[PDB]
JSON list of C-alpha atoms in Angstrom, two decimals:
[
{"chain": "A", "resi": 1, "resn": "UNK", "atom": "CA", "xyz": [0.01, -0.07, -0.17]},
{"chain": "A", "resi": 2, "resn": "UNK", "atom": "CA", "xyz": [1.36, 3.32, -1.39]},
{"chain": "A", "resi": 3, "resn": "UNK", "atom": "CA", "xyz": [-0.06, 2.08, -4.81]},
{"chain": "A", "resi": 4, "resn": "UNK", "atom": "CA", "xyz": [-3.30, 1.63, -3.19]},
{"chain": "A", "resi": 5, "resn": "UNK", "atom": "CA", "xyz": [-3.28, 5.13, -1.67]},
{"chain": "A", "resi": 6, "resn": "UNK", "atom": "CA", "xyz": [-2.44, 6.64, -5.23]},
{"chain": "A", "resi": 7, "resn": "UNK", "atom": "CA", "xyz": [-5.27, 4.57, -6.77]},
{"chain": "A", "resi": 8, "resn": "UNK", "atom": "CA", "xyz": [-7.91, 5.76, -4.51]},
{"chain": "A", "resi": 9, "resn": "UNK", "atom": "CA", "xyz": [-6.86, 9.13, -4.79]},
{"chain": "A", "resi": 10, "resn": "UNK", "atom": "CA", "xyz": [-6.68, 9.17, -8.78]},
{"chain": "A", "resi": 11, "resn": "UNK", "atom": "CA", "xyz": [-10.24, 7.39, -8.45]},
{"chain": "A", "resi": 12, "resn": "UNK", "atom": "CA", "xyz": [-11.66, 10.22, -6.04]},
{"chain": "A", "resi": 13, "resn": "UNK", "atom": "CA", "xyz": [-10.11, 12.83, -8.40]},
{"chain": "A", "resi": 14, "resn": "UNK", "atom": "CA", "xyz": [-12.36, 11.53, -11.35]},
{"chain": "A", "resi": 15, "resn": "UNK", "atom": "CA", "xyz": [-15.31, 11.67, -9.09]},
{"chain": "A", "resi": 16, "resn": "UNK", "atom": "CA", "xyz": [-14.56, 15.25, -8.09]},
{"chain": "A", "resi": 17, "resn": "UNK", "atom": "CA", "xyz": [-14.10, 16.31, -11.72]},
{"chain": "A", "resi": 18, "resn": "UNK", "atom": "CA", "xyz": [-17.41, 14.90, -12.73]},
{"chain": "A", "resi": 19, "resn": "UNK", "atom": "CA", "xyz": [-19.09, 16.53, -9.74]},
{"chain": "A", "resi": 20, "resn": "UNK", "atom": "CA", "xyz": [-17.77, 20.19, -10.57]},
{"chain": "A", "resi": 21, "resn": "UNK", "atom": "CA", "xyz": [-18.65, 19.60, -14.35]},
{"chain": "A", "resi": 22, "resn": "UNK", "atom": "CA", "xyz": [-22.09, 18.43, -13.70]},
{"chain": "A", "resi": 23, "resn": "UNK", "atom": "CA", "xyz": [-22.56, 21.35, -11.03]},
{"chain": "A", "resi": 24, "resn": "UNK", "atom": "CA", "xyz": [-21.28, 23.63, -13.97]},
{"chain": "A", "resi": 25, "resn": "UNK", "atom": "CA", "xyz": [-23.66, 22.23, -16.31]},
{"chain": "A", "resi": 26, "resn": "UNK", "atom": "CA", "xyz": [-26.56, 22.61, -13.93]},
{"chain": "A", "resi": 27, "resn": "UNK", "atom": "CA", "xyz": [-25.76, 26.21, -13.22]},
{"chain": "A", "resi": 28, "resn": "UNK", "atom": "CA", "xyz": [-25.85, 27.03, -17.07]},
{"chain": "A", "resi": 29, "resn": "UNK", "atom": "CA", "xyz": [-29.32, 25.60, -17.38]},
{"chain": "A", "resi": 30, "resn": "UNK", "atom": "CA", "xyz": [-30.41, 27.56, -14.11]},
{"chain": "A", "resi": 31, "resn": "UNK", "atom": "CA", "xyz": [-29.28, 30.63, -15.59]},
{"chain": "A", "resi": 32, "resn": "UNK", "atom": "CA", "xyz": [-30.90, 30.20, -18.82]},
{"chain": "A", "resi": 33, "resn": "UNK", "atom": "CA", "xyz": [-34.30, 29.40, -17.35]},
{"chain": "A", "resi": 34, "resn": "UNK", "atom": "CA", "xyz": [-34.22, 31.99, -14.80]},
{"chain": "A", "resi": 35, "resn": "UNK", "atom": "CA", "xyz": [-33.42, 34.63, -17.41]},
{"chain": "A", "resi": 36, "resn": "UNK", "atom": "CA", "xyz": [-35.95, 33.35, -19.92]},
{"chain": "A", "resi": 37, "resn": "UNK", "atom": "CA", "xyz": [-38.46, 33.44, -17.46]},
{"chain": "A", "resi": 38, "resn": "UNK", "atom": "CA", "xyz": [-37.38, 36.99, -16.18]},
{"chain": "A", "resi": 39, "resn": "UNK", "atom": "CA", "xyz": [-37.63, 38.15, -19.68]},
{"chain": "A", "resi": 40, "resn": "UNK", "atom": "CA", "xyz": [-41.21, 36.63, -20.17]},
{"chain": "A", "resi": 41, "resn": "UNK", "atom": "CA", "xyz": [-42.29, 38.34, -17.15]},
{"chain": "A", "resi": 42, "resn": "UNK", "atom": "CA", "xyz": [-40.98, 41.74, -18.36]},
{"chain": "A", "resi": 43, "resn": "UNK", "atom": "CA", "xyz": [-42.82, 41.24, -21.51]},
{"chain": "A", "resi": 44, "resn": "UNK", "atom": "CA", "xyz": [-46.13, 40.31, -19.76]},
{"chain": "A", "resi": 45, "resn": "UNK", "atom": "CA", "xyz": [-45.91, 43.31, -17.59]},
{"chain": "A", "resi": 46, "resn": "UNK", "atom": "CA", "xyz": [-45.52, 45.58, -20.71]},
{"chain": "A", "resi": 47, "resn": "UNK", "atom": "CA", "xyz": [-48.76, 44.22, -22.14]},
{"chain": "A", "resi": 48, "resn": "UNK", "atom": "CA", "xyz": [-43.05, 48.07, -10.95]},
{"chain": "A", "resi": 49, "resn": "UNK", "atom": "CA", "xyz": [-41.35, 46.31, -12.48]},
{"chain": "A", "resi": 50, "resn": "UNK", "atom": "CA", "xyz": [-38.00, 45.25, -11.11]},
{"chain": "A", "resi": 51, "resn": "UNK", "atom": "CA", "xyz": [-36.75, 41.73, -12.54]},
{"chain": "A", "resi": 52, "resn": "UNK", "atom": "CA", "xyz": [-33.30, 40.78, -12.03]},
{"chain": "A", "resi": 53, "resn": "UNK", "atom": "CA", "xyz": [-30.96, 38.64, -14.49]},
{"chain": "A", "resi": 54, "resn": "UNK", "atom": "CA", "xyz": [-28.68, 35.92, -13.38]},
{"chain": "A", "resi": 55, "resn": "UNK", "atom": "CA", "xyz": [-25.11, 36.14, -14.61]},
{"chain": "A", "resi": 56, "resn": "UNK", "atom": "CA", "xyz": [-22.88, 33.28, -13.37]},
{"chain": "A", "resi": 57, "resn": "UNK", "atom": "CA", "xyz": [-20.20, 34.00, -15.97]},
{"chain": "A", "resi": 58, "resn": "UNK", "atom": "CA", "xyz": [-17.52, 34.19, -13.45]},
{"chain": "A", "resi": 59, "resn": "UNK", "atom": "CA", "xyz": [-18.67, 31.04, -11.42]},
{"chain": "A", "resi": 60, "resn": "UNK", "atom": "CA", "xyz": [-18.98, 28.90, -14.46]},
{"chain": "A", "resi": 61, "resn": "UNK", "atom": "CA", "xyz": [-15.52, 29.65, -15.78]},
{"chain": "A", "resi": 62, "resn": "UNK", "atom": "CA", "xyz": [-14.08, 29.19, -12.21]},
{"chain": "A", "resi": 63, "resn": "UNK", "atom": "CA", "xyz": [-15.66, 25.73, -12.02]},
{"chain": "A", "resi": 64, "resn": "UNK", "atom": "CA", "xyz": [-14.10, 24.95, -15.50]},
{"chain": "A", "resi": 65, "resn": "UNK", "atom": "CA", "xyz": [-10.71, 25.94, -14.20]},
{"chain": "A", "resi": 66, "resn": "UNK", "atom": "CA", "xyz": [-11.26, 23.74, -10.90]},
{"chain": "A", "resi": 67, "resn": "UNK", "atom": "CA", "xyz": [-12.00, 20.68, -13.23]},
{"chain": "A", "resi": 68, "resn": "UNK", "atom": "CA", "xyz": [-8.72, 21.65, -15.17]},
{"chain": "A", "resi": 69, "resn": "UNK", "atom": "CA", "xyz": [-6.78, 22.24, -11.81]},
{"chain": "A", "resi": 70, "resn": "UNK", "atom": "CA", "xyz": [-7.88, 18.73, -10.51]},
{"chain": "A", "resi": 71, "resn": "UNK", "atom": "CA", "xyz": [-6.32, 17.08, -13.83]},
{"chain": "A", "resi": 72, "resn": "UNK", "atom": "CA", "xyz": [-2.89, 18.15, -12.77]},
{"chain": "A", "resi": 73, "resn": "UNK", "atom": "CA", "xyz": [-3.20, 16.39, -9.34]},
{"chain": "A", "resi": 74, "resn": "UNK", "atom": "CA", "xyz": [-3.31, 12.86, -11.06]},
{"chain": "A", "resi": 75, "resn": "UNK", "atom": "CA", "xyz": [-0.70, 10.41, -10.15]},
{"chain": "A", "resi": 76, "resn": "UNK", "atom": "CA", "xyz": [0.85, 8.28, -12.86]},
{"chain": "B", "resi": 1, "resn": "UNK", "atom": "CA", "xyz": [3.16, 9.45, 8.43]},
{"chain": "B", "resi": 2, "resn": "UNK", "atom": "CA", "xyz": [1.40, 7.25, 5.88]},
{"chain": "B", "resi": 3, "resn": "UNK", "atom": "CA", "xyz": [-1.32, 6.91, 8.50]},
{"chain": "B", "resi": 4, "resn": "UNK", "atom": "CA", "xyz": [-1.65, 10.59, 8.70]},
{"chain": "B", "resi": 5, "resn": "UNK", "atom": "CA", "xyz": [-1.87, 10.91, 4.93]},
{"chain": "B", "resi": 6, "resn": "UNK", "atom": "CA", "xyz": [-4.65, 8.33, 4.87]},
{"chain": "B", "resi": 7, "resn": "UNK", "atom": "CA", "xyz": [-6.52, 10.00, 7.87]},
{"chain": "B", "resi": 8, "resn": "UNK", "atom": "CA", "xyz": [-6.37, 13.27, 6.15]},
{"chain": "B", "resi": 9, "resn": "UNK", "atom": "CA", "xyz": [-7.66, 11.86, 2.91]},
{"chain": "B", "resi": 10, "resn": "UNK", "atom": "CA", "xyz": [-10.52, 10.00, 4.48]},
{"chain": "B", "resi": 11, "resn": "UNK", "atom": "CA", "xyz": [-11.29, 13.22, 6.30]},
{"chain": "B", "resi": 12, "resn": "UNK", "atom": "CA", "xyz": [-11.39, 15.20, 2.92]},
{"chain": "B", "resi": 13, "resn": "UNK", "atom": "CA", "xyz": [-13.56, 12.69, 1.32]},
{"chain": "B", "resi": 14, "resn": "UNK", "atom": "CA", "xyz": [-16.23, 12.99, 3.81]},
{"chain": "B", "resi": 15, "resn": "UNK", "atom": "CA", "xyz": [-16.19, 16.75, 3.30]},
{"chain": "B", "resi": 16, "resn": "UNK", "atom": "CA", "xyz": [-16.38, 16.32, -0.36]},
{"chain": "B", "resi": 17, "resn": "UNK", "atom": "CA", "xyz": [-19.32, 13.92, 0.08]},
{"chain": "B", "resi": 18, "resn": "UNK", "atom": "CA", "xyz": [-21.06, 16.39, 2.06]},
{"chain": "B", "resi": 19, "resn": "UNK", "atom": "CA", "xyz": [-20.42, 19.38, -0.48]},
{"chain": "B", "resi": 20, "resn": "UNK", "atom": "CA", "xyz": [-21.88, 17.36, -3.34]},
{"chain": "B", "resi": 21, "resn": "UNK", "atom": "CA", "xyz": [-24.96, 16.00, -1.32]},
{"chain": "B", "resi": 22, "resn": "UNK", "atom": "CA", "xyz": [-25.73, 19.73, -0.31]},
{"chain": "B", "resi": 23, "resn": "UNK", "atom": "CA", "xyz": [-25.00, 20.92, -3.83]},
{"chain": "B", "resi": 24, "resn": "UNK", "atom": "CA", "xyz": [-27.57, 18.24, -5.08]},
{"chain": "B", "resi": 25, "resn": "UNK", "atom": "CA", "xyz": [-30.33, 19.25, -2.35]},
{"chain": "B", "resi": 26, "resn": "UNK", "atom": "CA", "xyz": [-29.78, 22.74, -3.43]},
{"chain": "B", "resi": 27, "resn": "UNK", "atom": "CA", "xyz": [-30.37, 22.20, -7.01]},
{"chain": "B", "resi": 28, "resn": "UNK", "atom": "CA", "xyz": [-33.72, 20.34, -6.19]},
{"chain": "B", "resi": 29, "resn": "UNK", "atom": "CA", "xyz": [-34.79, 23.17, -4.32]},
{"chain": "B", "resi": 30, "resn": "UNK", "atom": "CA", "xyz": [-33.80, 25.69, -7.21]},
{"chain": "B", "resi": 31, "resn": "UNK", "atom": "CA", "xyz": [-35.66, 23.23, -9.86]},
{"chain": "B", "resi": 32, "resn": "UNK", "atom": "CA", "xyz": [-38.70, 23.15, -7.63]},
{"chain": "B", "resi": 33, "resn": "UNK", "atom": "CA", "xyz": [-38.91, 27.19, -7.12]},
{"chain": "B", "resi": 34, "resn": "UNK", "atom": "CA", "xyz": [-38.16, 28.09, -10.83]},
{"chain": "B", "resi": 35, "resn": "UNK", "atom": "CA", "xyz": [-40.65, 25.59, -12.17]},
{"chain": "B", "resi": 36, "resn": "UNK", "atom": "CA", "xyz": [-43.45, 26.65, -9.62]},
{"chain": "B", "resi": 37, "resn": "UNK", "atom": "CA", "xyz": [-42.74, 30.49, -10.56]},
{"chain": "B", "resi": 38, "resn": "UNK", "atom": "CA", "xyz": [-42.94, 29.44, -14.21]},
{"chain": "B", "resi": 39, "resn": "UNK", "atom": "CA", "xyz": [-46.29, 27.93, -13.96]},
{"chain": "B", "resi": 40, "resn": "UNK", "atom": "CA", "xyz": [-47.50, 30.67, -11.87]},
{"chain": "B", "resi": 41, "resn": "UNK", "atom": "CA", "xyz": [-46.23, 33.32, -14.65]},
{"chain": "B", "resi": 42, "resn": "UNK", "atom": "CA", "xyz": [-48.11, 31.14, -17.28]},
{"chain": "B", "resi": 43, "resn": "UNK", "atom": "CA", "xyz": [-51.29, 30.90, -15.30]},
{"chain": "B", "resi": 44, "resn": "UNK", "atom": "CA", "xyz": [-51.22, 34.75, -14.75]},
{"chain": "B", "resi": 45, "resn": "UNK", "atom": "CA", "xyz": [-50.59, 35.36, -18.45]},
{"chain": "B", "resi": 46, "resn": "UNK", "atom": "CA", "xyz": [-53.72, 33.23, -19.38]},
{"chain": "B", "resi": 47, "resn": "UNK", "atom": "CA", "xyz": [-55.77, 35.63, -17.22]},
{"chain": "B", "resi": 48, "resn": "UNK", "atom": "CA", "xyz": [-46.01, 35.73, -25.75]},
{"chain": "B", "resi": 49, "resn": "UNK", "atom": "CA", "xyz": [-45.49, 33.78, -23.72]},
{"chain": "B", "resi": 50, "resn": "UNK", "atom": "CA", "xyz": [-42.33, 31.76, -23.71]},
{"chain": "B", "resi": 51, "resn": "UNK", "atom": "CA", "xyz": [-41.50, 30.39, -20.13]},
{"chain": "B", "resi": 52, "resn": "UNK", "atom": "CA", "xyz": [-38.99, 27.48, -19.74]},
{"chain": "B", "resi": 53, "resn": "UNK", "atom": "CA", "xyz": [-39.00, 24.66, -17.23]},
{"chain": "B", "resi": 54, "resn": "UNK", "atom": "CA", "xyz": [-35.77, 23.43, -15.37]},
{"chain": "B", "resi": 55, "resn": "UNK", "atom": "CA", "xyz": [-34.97, 19.87, -15.57]},
{"chain": "B", "resi": 56, "resn": "UNK", "atom": "CA", "xyz": [-31.81, 18.77, -13.65]},
{"chain": "B", "resi": 57, "resn": "UNK", "atom": "CA", "xyz": [-32.73, 15.10, -13.64]},
{"chain": "B", "resi": 58, "resn": "UNK", "atom": "CA", "xyz": [-29.41, 14.22, -15.25]},
{"chain": "B", "resi": 59, "resn": "UNK", "atom": "CA", "xyz": [-27.49, 16.38, -13.10]},
{"chain": "B", "resi": 60, "resn": "UNK", "atom": "CA", "xyz": [-28.84, 15.37, -9.70]},
{"chain": "B", "resi": 61, "resn": "UNK", "atom": "CA", "xyz": [-28.54, 11.74, -10.50]},
{"chain": "B", "resi": 62, "resn": "UNK", "atom": "CA", "xyz": [-24.96, 12.48, -11.53]},
{"chain": "B", "resi": 63, "resn": "UNK", "atom": "CA", "xyz": [-24.28, 14.01, -8.29]},
{"chain": "B", "resi": 64, "resn": "UNK", "atom": "CA", "xyz": [-25.62, 11.04, -6.31]},
{"chain": "B", "resi": 65, "resn": "UNK", "atom": "CA", "xyz": [-23.39, 8.95, -8.38]},
{"chain": "B", "resi": 66, "resn": "UNK", "atom": "CA", "xyz": [-20.39, 11.19, -7.47]},
{"chain": "B", "resi": 67, "resn": "UNK", "atom": "CA", "xyz": [-21.12, 10.99, -3.80]},
{"chain": "B", "resi": 68, "resn": "UNK", "atom": "CA", "xyz": [-21.45, 7.04, -4.38]},
{"chain": "B", "resi": 69, "resn": "UNK", "atom": "CA", "xyz": [-18.06, 7.02, -6.09]},
{"chain": "B", "resi": 70, "resn": "UNK", "atom": "CA", "xyz": [-16.31, 8.90, -3.48]},
{"chain": "B", "resi": 71, "resn": "UNK", "atom": "CA", "xyz": [-17.42, 6.25, -1.00]},
{"chain": "B", "resi": 72, "resn": "UNK", "atom": "CA", "xyz": [-15.42, 3.63, -2.82]},
{"chain": "B", "resi": 73, "resn": "UNK", "atom": "CA", "xyz": [-12.18, 5.84, -2.33]},
{"chain": "B", "resi": 74, "resn": "UNK", "atom": "CA", "xyz": [-12.06, 5.40, 1.51]},
{"chain": "B", "resi": 75, "resn": "UNK", "atom": "CA", "xyz": [-9.19, 3.98, 3.03]},
{"chain": "B", "resi": 76, "resn": "UNK", "atom": "CA", "xyz": [-9.77, 1.37, 6.08]},
{"chain": "C", "resi": 1, "resn": "UNK", "atom": "CA", "xyz": [7.50, 9.97, -3.84]},
{"chain": "C", "resi": 2, "resn": "UNK", "atom": "CA", "xyz": [5.48, 10.36, -0.62]},
{"chain": "C", "resi": 3, "resn": "UNK", "atom": "CA", "xyz": [6.36, 14.11, -0.94]},
{"chain": "C", "resi": 4, "resn": "UNK", "atom": "CA", "xyz": [4.82, 14.16, -4.36]},
{"chain": "C", "resi": 5, "resn": "UNK", "atom": "CA", "xyz": [1.77, 12.54, -3.05]},
{"chain": "C", "resi": 6, "resn": "UNK", "atom": "CA", "xyz": [1.25, 15.09, -0.39]},
{"chain": "C", "resi": 7, "resn": "UNK", "atom": "CA", "xyz": [1.88, 17.87, -2.93]},
{"chain": "C", "resi": 8, "resn": "UNK", "atom": "CA", "xyz": [-0.65, 16.62, -5.38]},
{"chain": "C", "resi": 9, "resn": "UNK", "atom": "CA", "xyz": [-3.17, 16.14, -2.43]},
{"chain": "C", "resi": 10, "resn": "UNK", "atom": "CA", "xyz": [-2.62, 19.75, -1.21]},
{"chain": "C", "resi": 11, "resn": "UNK", "atom": "CA", "xyz": [-2.89, 20.97, -4.63]},
{"chain": "C", "resi": 12, "resn": "UNK", "atom": "CA", "xyz": [-6.14, 19.12, -5.10]},
{"chain": "C", "resi": 13, "resn": "UNK", "atom": "CA", "xyz": [-7.75, 20.48, -1.76]},
{"chain": "C", "resi": 14, "resn": "UNK", "atom": "CA", "xyz": [-6.88, 23.97, -3.08]},
{"chain": "C", "resi": 15, "resn": "UNK", "atom": "CA", "xyz": [-8.99, 23.27, -6.09]},
{"chain": "C", "resi": 16, "resn": "UNK", "atom": "CA", "xyz": [-11.84, 21.59, -4.20]},
{"chain": "C", "resi": 17, "resn": "UNK", "atom": "CA", "xyz": [-12.02, 24.55, -1.74]},
{"chain": "C", "resi": 18, "resn": "UNK", "atom": "CA", "xyz": [-12.24, 26.96, -4.63]},
{"chain": "C", "resi": 19, "resn": "UNK", "atom": "CA", "xyz": [-15.14, 24.70, -6.36]},
{"chain": "C", "resi": 20, "resn": "UNK", "atom": "CA", "xyz": [-17.41, 24.80, -3.25]},
{"chain": "C", "resi": 21, "resn": "UNK", "atom": "CA", "xyz": [-16.69, 28.46, -2.53]},
{"chain": "C", "resi": 22, "resn": "UNK", "atom": "CA", "xyz": [-17.62, 29.26, -6.15]},
{"chain": "C", "resi": 23, "resn": "UNK", "atom": "CA", "xyz": [-20.61, 26.87, -5.96]},
{"chain": "C", "resi": 24, "resn": "UNK", "atom": "CA", "xyz": [-21.71, 28.60, -2.63]},
{"chain": "C", "resi": 25, "resn": "UNK", "atom": "CA", "xyz": [-21.41, 31.95, -4.31]},
{"chain": "C", "resi": 26, "resn": "UNK", "atom": "CA", "xyz": [-23.57, 30.91, -7.34]},
{"chain": "C", "resi": 27, "resn": "UNK", "atom": "CA", "xyz": [-26.30, 29.68, -5.11]},
{"chain": "C", "resi": 28, "resn": "UNK", "atom": "CA", "xyz": [-26.45, 32.90, -3.47]},
{"chain": "C", "resi": 29, "resn": "UNK", "atom": "CA", "xyz": [-26.82, 34.67, -6.71]},
{"chain": "C", "resi": 30, "resn": "UNK", "atom": "CA", "xyz": [-29.45, 32.11, -7.89]},
{"chain": "C", "resi": 31, "resn": "UNK", "atom": "CA", "xyz": [-31.55, 32.63, -4.69]},
{"chain": "C", "resi": 32, "resn": "UNK", "atom": "CA", "xyz": [-31.48, 36.63, -4.95]},
{"chain": "C", "resi": 33, "resn": "UNK", "atom": "CA", "xyz": [-32.50, 36.42, -8.62]},
{"chain": "C", "resi": 34, "resn": "UNK", "atom": "CA", "xyz": [-35.24, 33.67, -8.15]},
{"chain": "C", "resi": 35, "resn": "UNK", "atom": "CA", "xyz": [-36.76, 35.57, -5.33]},
{"chain": "C", "resi": 36, "resn": "UNK", "atom": "CA", "xyz": [-36.46, 39.01, -6.62]},
{"chain": "C", "resi": 37, "resn": "UNK", "atom": "CA", "xyz": [-38.36, 37.76, -9.76]},
{"chain": "C", "resi": 38, "resn": "UNK", "atom": "CA", "xyz": [-41.09, 35.99, -7.59]},
{"chain": "C", "resi": 39, "resn": "UNK", "atom": "CA", "xyz": [-41.82, 39.05, -5.69]},
{"chain": "C", "resi": 40, "resn": "UNK", "atom": "CA", "xyz": [-41.97, 41.11, -9.12]},
{"chain": "C", "resi": 41, "resn": "UNK", "atom": "CA", "xyz": [-44.41, 38.34, -10.31]},
{"chain": "C", "resi": 42, "resn": "UNK", "atom": "CA", "xyz": [-46.37, 38.63, -7.09]},
{"chain": "C", "resi": 43, "resn": "UNK", "atom": "CA", "xyz": [-46.64, 42.54, -7.44]},
{"chain": "C", "resi": 44, "resn": "UNK", "atom": "CA", "xyz": [-47.77, 42.32, -11.18]},
{"chain": "C", "resi": 45, "resn": "UNK", "atom": "CA", "xyz": [-50.46, 39.70, -10.26]},
{"chain": "C", "resi": 46, "resn": "UNK", "atom": "CA", "xyz": [-51.74, 42.23, -7.65]},
{"chain": "C", "resi": 47, "resn": "UNK", "atom": "CA", "xyz": [-52.08, 44.91, -10.30]},
{"chain": "C", "resi": 48, "resn": "UNK", "atom": "CA", "xyz": [-53.98, 32.06, -8.26]},
{"chain": "C", "resi": 49, "resn": "UNK", "atom": "CA", "xyz": [-51.20, 33.03, -7.40]},
{"chain": "C", "resi": 50, "resn": "UNK", "atom": "CA", "xyz": [-48.77, 30.55, -5.96]},
{"chain": "C", "resi": 51, "resn": "UNK", "atom": "CA", "xyz": [-45.25, 31.70, -5.92]},
{"chain": "C", "resi": 52, "resn": "UNK", "atom": "CA", "xyz": [-42.38, 30.15, -4.09]},
{"chain": "C", "resi": 53, "resn": "UNK", "atom": "CA", "xyz": [-39.39, 31.64, -2.53]},
{"chain": "C", "resi": 54, "resn": "UNK", "atom": "CA", "xyz": [-35.94, 29.91, -2.55]},
{"chain": "C", "resi": 55, "resn": "UNK", "atom": "CA", "xyz": [-34.35, 29.69, 0.90]},
{"chain": "C", "resi": 56, "resn": "UNK", "atom": "CA", "xyz": [-30.89, 28.00, 0.69]},
{"chain": "C", "resi": 57, "resn": "UNK", "atom": "CA", "xyz": [-29.65, 29.15, 4.07]},
{"chain": "C", "resi": 58, "resn": "UNK", "atom": "CA", "xyz": [-28.84, 25.56, 5.29]},
{"chain": "C", "resi": 59, "resn": "UNK", "atom": "CA", "xyz": [-27.15, 24.53, 2.08]},
{"chain": "C", "resi": 60, "resn": "UNK", "atom": "CA", "xyz": [-24.94, 27.69, 1.74]},
{"chain": "C", "resi": 61, "resn": "UNK", "atom": "CA", "xyz": [-23.78, 27.43, 5.42]},
{"chain": "C", "resi": 62, "resn": "UNK", "atom": "CA", "xyz": [-23.05, 23.68, 4.83]},
{"chain": "C", "resi": 63, "resn": "UNK", "atom": "CA", "xyz": [-20.98, 24.62, 1.81]},
{"chain": "C", "resi": 64, "resn": "UNK", "atom": "CA", "xyz": [-19.07, 27.01, 3.89]},
{"chain": "C", "resi": 65, "resn": "UNK", "atom": "CA", "xyz": [-18.26, 24.43, 6.52]},
{"chain": "C", "resi": 66, "resn": "UNK", "atom": "CA", "xyz": [-17.22, 21.93, 3.79]},
{"chain": "C", "resi": 67, "resn": "UNK", "atom": "CA", "xyz": [-14.53, 24.45, 2.75]},
{"chain": "C", "resi": 68, "resn": "UNK", "atom": "CA", "xyz": [-13.55, 25.03, 6.40]},
{"chain": "C", "resi": 69, "resn": "UNK", "atom": "CA", "xyz": [-13.24, 21.07, 6.82]},
{"chain": "C", "resi": 70, "resn": "UNK", "atom": "CA", "xyz": [-11.13, 20.75, 3.72]},
{"chain": "C", "resi": 71, "resn": "UNK", "atom": "CA", "xyz": [-8.73, 23.40, 5.37]},
{"chain": "C", "resi": 72, "resn": "UNK", "atom": "CA", "xyz": [-7.97, 20.99, 8.01]},
{"chain": "C", "resi": 73, "resn": "UNK", "atom": "CA", "xyz": [-6.93, 18.21, 5.60]},
{"chain": "C", "resi": 74, "resn": "UNK", "atom": "CA", "xyz": [-3.96, 19.89, 4.53]},
{"chain": "C", "resi": 75, "resn": "UNK", "atom": "CA", "xyz": [-0.54, 18.29, 4.80]},
{"chain": "C", "resi": 76, "resn": "UNK", "atom": "CA", "xyz": [2.34, 20.57, 6.31]}
]
């Protein structure tokens, strides 16, 4: 066991990468839905009003970099 | 120290599992709220309109599998 | 290599902390946008209706604790 540690660590890294990739994908969908429905509300109102748009550009790019960074922790 | 490495790794794994479980729980709530409020908007409009529903089925199941996968990286 | 394992592990921990911090930040923004737009909808309706508010207090605090817990897995 030093080889077994490295195996479990690489294995965990793969799971962590999937989790943040998936999280990033979910946030994109949330942004699109919230913003579509905000614009629909604004349009209906035209036919206060203070709606807000979601912008998660920074967060989504940051999650992508996190998955990238994890790639560099793998053990050959 | 090889025992201390394994301890810190198991400890980190526990934190990672909690994080993705919590993230998964939050996404479920976001989906429910966004969709409830989209349906409320559609109903009000009936009384363009292009509202969108959130479906994060794939992402939430994927997060569950990630937490499952992490379980398999523990060191006895 | 035992030093290389510890280095990659610390490196991965840093990435994991960033990911959950970023995720936590994104959820805060999602909560604010969804709730602002729910209140806007309620106001427009006043001028069923069953809108829902998002509260991710537990999840956001939990993510903060996860980042805290990860800090304690670092190897000197």
